[PDB]
Fold:
Amino acid sequence: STGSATTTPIDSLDDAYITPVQIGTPAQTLNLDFDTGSSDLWVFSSETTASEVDGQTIYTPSKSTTAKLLSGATWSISYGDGSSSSGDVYTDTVSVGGLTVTGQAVESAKKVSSSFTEDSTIDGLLGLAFSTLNTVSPTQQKTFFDNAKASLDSPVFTADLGYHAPGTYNFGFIDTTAYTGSITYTAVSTKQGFWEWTSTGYAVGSGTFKSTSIDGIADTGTTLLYLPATVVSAYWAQVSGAKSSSSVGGYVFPCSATLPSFTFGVGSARIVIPGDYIDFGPISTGSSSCFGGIQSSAGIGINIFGDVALKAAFVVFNGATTPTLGFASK
Ligand SMILES: NCc1ccc(C(F)(F)F)cc1
Structure:
């Protein structure tokens, strides 16, 4: 079996991507943020605290004839950005573009943090990292990809995120028309539960490729590219007027600048992120100072190849016996 769904940026800045998901019987469509950096499928629901719901579409388990309360199960997650959500669990039918899973754990939110309330376009998350990170207690649950993997034509899923444009999430197959050249595969470590790999280095614009091992995760749920401070300082040093602002919380640059591109290595292959992808607009409404898309990972603990980097490539998340990551230019 296969699944194919269109993913859309939530705003003009590509702050996040949403993808329609059908839950329950009859189908209740929720626009979820597919997240390769987490492993909980959670949604805004009829149980969410009234004041914490602001325009999102909710899941009403009592209206699904196939929804079953998972006895004594609760979930609670805190993301790298300081955001969080928690609640109870149901098992229900979940479909993504024609691919269906019955008995999928659907984590119903009782509470969500301010940033989730503020994003009215995000109805919840669909975790695509390894099921070892799932927060359901006392009995851990599997991801949608984990539940479907055996039935797929090929145990893979691809992320083809668009820059200011619609894109695609495919399950079970590789669309050979969705990329140029070849897919270069690289080794993955599942020790921290993430699609963790090692980049072979970087270049800034037309500069010399610096060969250096950058360990990081492929994370569709994180907007920006987070890299070591030495790497990030070398990039912003090429932009006139760019500086690291402690008030803003990262590198800012004059909005009139034309940013150089950023290249990251995948084995001997190279993925080029065009400079325009690194522009995240004014720091505040009306400001002539813009926020950067490449930031330091020094206070994070790990490097994150977020949407800024992933949207420059066709990305294969290979769930074979030994998982690997594939990257191709597009
Ligand atoms: N990395 C997961 C994630 C995704 C979205 C959000 C936000 F912005 F919706 F709150 C927070 C955390």
Q: What stands out?
A: Residues 16, 33, 35, 37-38, 79, 81, 83, 115-116, 119, 122, 221-222 surround [4-(trifluoromethyl)phenyl]methanamine (CB under 6 Å). Helices lie at 114-118, 144-148, 229-236, 307-310. The chain is about 5% helix and 45% strand.
